[PDB]
Copies of this chain bind each other. A is one copy, B any other.
């Protein structure tokens, strides 16, 4: 699915420019892997891998785990992904 906007500007640099200066060095490959999974998935259920720990947020937002409590969150509207974020929850 298309990523329409980024809340976390480090993810934006990584996805759009391949720039790694905005994300932790130890999670660059894992974050890019999950960005590649979002960009390839045509439906939300295609992200329901158990290691991703996909679950809705409590409306319209979703969460996938990168590592430990570090997660990627986004908003699912119009079949696209909005407000991409990388936070420690």
Measured CB to CB, the residues of A under 8 A from B are 1-2, 42-43, 77-80
Contact = CB atoms under 8 A, between A and B. Distances in A.
Q: DSSP class of A's interface residues: helix, strand, loop or mixed?
A: loop
Nearest to A2: B43
Contacts of A2: 43
A5 to B, nearest CB: 16
Contacts of A79: 1, 78-80
Contacts of A42: 1, 42
The list of the 8 closest CB pairs from A to B, nearest first, reads A79-B79, A42-B42, A78-B79, A78-B78, A79-B80, A2-B43, A1-B79, A1-B42
A52 B1 CA distance: 24
A42 B43 CA distance: 10
9 contacts: A1-B42, A1-B79, A2-B43, A42-B42, A77-B78, A78-B78, A78-B79, A79-B79, A79-B80
